[PDB]
Structure formats: structure tokens, C-alpha cells
Design a binder for this molecule. Structure first.
Ligand SMILES: CCCCCCCCCCCCCC(=O)SCCNC(=O)CCNC(=O)[C@H](O)C(C)(C)COP(=O)(O)OP(=O)(O)OC[C@H]1O[C@@H](n2cnc3c(N)ncnc32)[C@@H](O)[C@@H]1OP(=O)(O)O
Ligand SMILES: CCCCCCCCCCCCCC(=O)SCCNC(=O)CCNC(=O)[C@H](O)C(C)(C)COP(=O)(O)OP(=O)(O)OC[C@H]1O[C@@H](n2cnc3c(N)ncnc32)[C@@H](O)[C@@H]1OP(=O)(O)O
Lengths: 223, 223
């Protein structure tokens, strides 16, 4: 089911990870690499292009190809790669990701309440008739955080969130299987609507942080 | 100098923008599209793959290709595309981007001071012997914000920042041409070092916001 290009890409990535190709070193020449992996030169060129695009490698025409430290070259889209290939960083990464979600959402949620309260309420209202199951909630939660990011009026927040949908719902489907996770979330969306209704922009920060800690307790107990 | 693939990609993107291909509609069939643009079917397939990857289109094997609203599908890497092709959103987007930079840096800078103060100081010290010119400062500024993002211990902040280097230094080279922009920045890095030295984690938020407003005044006067 895995194409030769797919096999080649995965082999190079894992080789960087296990250090066959340590970050900061150059990749063996293409003939050698293609013979080692078992793919044509055309297949290898295409795979190197994709890996360079995702920040794993730096390529320059007519020059050796360097292995990067992806931590300083890659963007958010590698999160799904680390996940797919089961990197060791995954567990702590989701915690890091949820911490980031909590903290930057304190920013755009407050802005959304100040700038476009009606849109924010519209987004929050979607929680009203949601089905009581994991799948419905993972979907709902993603749309509420993203909808509020969009409602801030600063689209950069939405672009940040845009790629995690799959990963996002993934963590969410596991998390929202717990009815208590679903209840805390409904309480959270309801309190956000109230705060936006009351124009209590100042209370957003502590409310979101509190939901971060508590949802954190539930998540950790689970996992 | 522009390849046929490059011409094809740019033509489709601009067509979405000027609405020849409105978001939510499907793209004309491939034979028609390739004849319209003047590229082979192979070239078009490769270009559609790239556009789908960047979120402009949604493709599904054996199904019509849909034109997306990139605002809800694309990630941060499209910022350089909007820039390259001169979208109308560009001017306000950089303001949005600088607002985001200010607000999320309040988060990771404070965390960096609390978690890895030595690394944070090391990063800030790089300002000490920097050359007094636009290029040196744009480079320095990017490395200090990213270095502090890395020093927070949460690598997600670094991944967010990682792609803007080119765009980042671009805005920075224009901004730091002004000696006053360079002076305010040095004052800012020096004050951050002092705060980290004093363990005054609580003052990070207002200091960064203040630098955001003031650097904002300089930038706007310029532009
Ligand atoms: C926008 C970018 C894209 C990210 C979005 C995509 C992510 C996919 C979304 C997943 C699907 C949604 C389903 C869910 O709702 S799961 C949500 C479960 N919550 C959760 O896992 C906790 C998230 N963490 C947080 O919200 C914050 O980390 C805390 C509020 C808990 C803490 O704030 P921080 O700023 O990060 O650190 P601080 O120094 O204040 O406090 C440290 C203290 O906090 C605890 N802690 C618990 N979980 C933590 C994470 N993830 N990071 C850091 N600390 C975390 C303590 O263990 C810690 O130390 P202490 O000894 O003092 O308790
Ligand atoms: C991490 C994600 C990737 C982003 C990094 C890549 C970006 C490339 C980096 C560019 C290279 C660096 C060179 C430079 O140092 S240029 C820096 C110049 N500063 C600057 O342009 C101002 C940045 N804006 C801000 O810092 C904040 O917006 C403010 C502190 C000014 C305001 O905070 P916000 O939260 O955004 O809004 P708030 O409601 O509190 O205040 C609104 C008030 O602020 C003014 N304002 C000025 N510039 C503004 C931007 N960019 N957005 C929003 N408001 C901005 C006012 O006009 C506004 O209304 P008021 O009538 O009340 O004054």
C-alpha cells in the first residue's frame, strides 16, 4: 500500500531520527542513496524536494544536500509527521500543543469578544444542540476554537489552527469519549457566552487558563 | 525565468482571487484547464497537487477538484504567497502578523524567563556587539524572538516562527533602516535581560506590549 516514494521519504526521515544521517551532516550522494533505498533517481529527486519543502533538508542546486535540525526549519505541518511515524517527542508534544492552545486562545477569544461579539456568540451557540458523543464533541470543540480565532478579526490565528484539524480531532475523539470531558467543555462554552454577553473581556484570561488546568487533569488521568 | 508549472500555479491562484474560479466552486475539468493555461496534463497534475498541499484546492481521486476558501484551509506558509503575488490583504496582514508576534511572544518570553533563564540571557546577549545597520538588526531581531521561543522549552512556538524568517527579515530590513527603530529595539532587548536578571516575570507582559505599541508608531510613520 506504500508507494516507493512513500517508502523513500519515511526511510530518510527515520534515518535522520536514528542518526544514520545526523542533523548538520550532508546526505550521501544521490546514486548511493537511491541504491541504498531501492528507488529510481527520479523518485529520489521528488522525495528530496518534498523533504526539503517540509524543512527536513536544505537543498541547493549543484550543491550537497544538508540534513537540518527540523526543530529550527520545519513549520507546524510536521506535527502530523512526528505523529504518523511515532516520534519519541509525541507525548510531550501534545501537552506542549494544548498549552499553546490555551495560551494563544486567551488572546484571540478576548479580541473576538471585544471586536466581533455577535460572531463570537454565533460560534458559541453551536454547542447548544450538539450530540452527546466523542465524535460530535471533537468536531464541535475544533470549530469553536477556530471560529473564535476567525471572529477575532485577525486571520493569522486561524491559519495557525487550520492545519491541526485532523490531529486536533484525533486528540479530541480520544478525550471527549469521557462524559466528564464533555460536561466540562459545555460548562466552558456556556461561561464564554455569558462573559461575551456581559462584555467581561477581562475575565477571559482566567476562565480559559482555568479550563486549561482542569481539562488538563481529565486528559492526564485518561491518556 | 518562470517555468510553465510556475505560470500555471500563479494563474490558478490569481483566478481564485479575481474570482474566475470562486471559492466553493469546482475547477474546470483538467483537459479544459490545461488547454486554457497552456501546460501539459502532467504539468497540470503536479501543479494541482502543490496547490492542494498549500490548501488552495481540495482534491479527491476520481472526483471534481474544489476551490477552497484558503482562509480556512491554508497554514502560515501562504503568507509568502500572498506577499509574492501582491494580494490586497498584505498591508493589513503585516499589522495582524506584528500584533500576533507581540501577543504570543508575551507568552513564550515569560515562560523562557521562568524555565530557562540562562538560555534566555544567552539569546539576549547577542544584541551586545551587533552592527549598527538594517541588515544586522533584522537578522538579530528574528534570532532573539525565535531564540526566546526555543528557550521557553515549548518547541511549538519555534515551529510557528520558523517559516517567517524570509518574510520576517523582509519587514525587518525595511523597519530597521531607521536608526530610531534600532535604538528602541536595543532598549527593549536590554530591558528584557534586566527583567530576566531580576526574575521579574510579571513585568514581561506590559514591557512587550509597550514595545509593541511604540515600535508600532515608528513602523506606521515609516512604511
Ligand atoms: C493554536 C496552535 C495549535 C494548537 C491546537 C491544536 C491542538 C489539538 C487540540 C486537541 C483537541 C482538543 C481536545 C481537548 O480539549 S484536550 C484539552 C486538555 N487540556 C490539557 O491537556 C491541558 C493543556 N495545558 C494547559 O492548558 C496549560 O499548560 C496550563 C493552564 C495547565 C498551564 O499553563 P502554562 O502556561 O502552560 O504553564 P504554567 O507555568 O502556567 O503552569 C505549569 C503547570 O501546569 C500544569 N500543566 C498541565 N498540563 C500542562 C501542559 N500541557 N503544559 C504545561 N504545564 C501543564 C502542571 O503540571 C504545571 O506545573 P505545576 O507543578 O505547577 O502544576
Ligand atoms: C509568531 C507568529 C509569526 C509572526 C512573526 C513574523 C512577523 C515578521 C516580523 C517583522 C520583522 C520585525 C521588525 C519589527 O520589529 S516591526 C515591529 C513594529 N511594531 C508594530 O508594527 C506593532 C505591532 N502591533 C502590536 O504590537 C499590537 O497590535 C499593539 C500592542 C499595538 C496592540 O495590541 P493588540 O492586542 O493587537 O490590540 P489592542 O486591542 O490591545 O490595541 C489596539 C490598538 O493598538 C494600535 N495598533 C497598532 N498597531 C496595531 C496592530 N498591528 N494591530 C492592532 N492594533 C494595532 C491601535 O491602532 C489600536 O487601536 P487604538 O485606537 O485603541 O489605538
Amino acid at each position: 500500500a506504500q508507494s516507493p516514494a512513500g517508502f523513500a521519504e519515511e526511510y530518510i526521515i527515520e534515518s535522520i531520527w536514528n542518526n544514520r544521517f545526523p542533523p548538520g551532516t550532508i546526505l550521501p550522494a544521490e546514486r548511493e542513496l537511491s541504491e541504498l533505498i531501492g528507488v529510481t533517481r527520479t523518485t529520489l529527486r521528488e522525495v528530496l524536494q518534498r523533504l526539503a519543502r517540509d524543512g527536513w533538508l536544505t537543498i541547493q542546486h549543484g550543491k550537497p544536500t544538508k540534513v537540518n535540525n527540523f526543530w529550527e526549519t520545519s513549520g507546524l505541518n510536521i506535527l502530523e509527521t512526528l505523529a504518523r511515524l511515532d516520534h519519541e517527542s509525541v507525548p510531550q508534544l501534545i501537552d506542549n500543543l494544548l498549552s499553546v492552545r490555551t495560551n494563544i486562545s486567551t488572546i484571540f477569544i478576548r479580541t473576538a469578544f471585544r471586536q466581533h461579539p455577535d460572531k463570537a456568540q454565533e460560534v458559541l451557540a453551536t454547542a447548544n444542540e450538539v450530540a452527546d458523543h466523542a465524535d460530535a464533541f471533537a468536531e464541535l470543540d475544533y470549530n469553536i476554537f477556530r471560529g473564535l480565532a476567525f471572529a477575532s478579526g485577525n486571520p493569522i490565528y486561524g491559519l495557525i489552527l487550520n492545519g491541526m484539524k485532523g490531529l486536533y480531532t484525533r486528540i479530541g475523539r480520544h478525550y471527549f469519549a469521557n462524559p466528564e470531558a464533555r460536561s466540562l467543555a459545555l460548562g466552558f462554552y456556556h461561561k464564554l457566552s455569558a462573559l461575551c454577553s456581559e462584555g467581561a473581556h477581562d475575565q477571559v484570561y482566567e476562565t480559559v487558563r482555568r479550563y486549561g488546568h482542569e481539562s488538563g487533569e481529565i486528559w492526564h488521568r485518561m491518556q
